[PDB]
């Protein structure tokens, strides 16, 4: 899998986290 | 806006994320 | 302290975050 | 949205920047 | 000086670049 | 192209690498 | 090729960018 | 798990890769 | 706190370092 | 020595790793 | 060995650098 | 100019810093 660096929609500040896809 | 790499306050968690400002 | 990159235990969508250790 | 680290197309410049998607 | 990672307003794609301040 | 961070399929020790996509 | 981080000659606001060398 | 950035001893160039631990 | 990248005042060889702000 | 972030030549793999020089 | 991104102790300086371990 | 990420020889720990060249 790969890590996407995306805003967390489950965060009221749209913090950019790593998403493991 | 800017993206800064910061520890998210308010917790013990120690998470460092991209904050959009 | 150092910046670690770890899976966020508890997160429900396989998140990877910086961590201040 | 996500931020990817990509070479900006269309040029010779070779610039790599954060693209917001 | 420091490098801020910010959207370029002189870019029609808001590409995130390093700004030297 | 963009820099992706993905697991290295085939690698025997769970390696994560940049990938030029 | 390698990712270099260099000042963008020509840019009018002291920009620093990745560069594919 | 976390990603350690370490030389690969299974590489004759000691390339630094992400190790998933 | 956030990771800034700044010139190291005092350093005699134009060093750029992370800075915990 | 320096660490550069480069695509490892010789292959199709597209791996980008830290090279020590 | 590994490279970690850590604040260098012993000072007020707040410098974050790559430590080789 | 560009930033090289190199061990500081004026450091007894060979810490990797950004060198402005």
Residue numbers in the entry:
A (entry chain C), B (entry chain A), C (entry chain B), D (entry chain A), E (entry chain C), F (entry chain B), ...: 1 to 21
Authors' text:
We designed 2AT-L as a covalently stabilized analogue of a triangular trimer formed by 2AM-L. The design of 2AT-L is based on the previously reported X-ray crystallographic structures of triangular trimers composed of β-hairpin peptides derived from Aβ17–36.88−90 At the three corners of these triangular trimers, Leu17 of one monomer subunit is near Ala21 of an adjacent monomer subunit. To stabilize 2AM-L into a triangular trimer, we mutated Leu17 and Ala21 to cysteine to create 2AM-LCC. The X-ray crystallographic structure reveals that 2AT-L is composed of three folded β-hairpins that are cross-linked together in the envisioned manner, in which Cys17 on one monomer forms a disulfide bond with Cys21 of the adjacent monomer at each corner. The Aβ17–23 and Aβ30–36 β-strands of the three β-hairpins that comprise 2AT-L consist mainly of residues from the hydrophobic central and C-terminal regions of Aβ, creating two hydrophobic surfaces on 2AT-L. The three hydrophilic Aβ24–29 loops extend off the hydrophobic core of 2AT-L. In the crystal lattice, four copies of 2AT-L assemble to form a ball-shaped dodecamer. The dodecamer is stabilized by an edge-to-edge hydrogen-bonding network between the backbones of adjacent trimers and by hydrophobic packing at the core of the dodecamer between the surfaces of the trimers that contain Val18, Phe20, and Ile31. The outer surface of the dodecamer displays the hydrophobic amino acids on the other surface of the trimer—Phe19, Ile32, Leu34, and Val36, as well as the disulfide bond between Cys17 and Cys21. In the crystal lattice, six dodecamers pack together to form an annular pore-like structure.
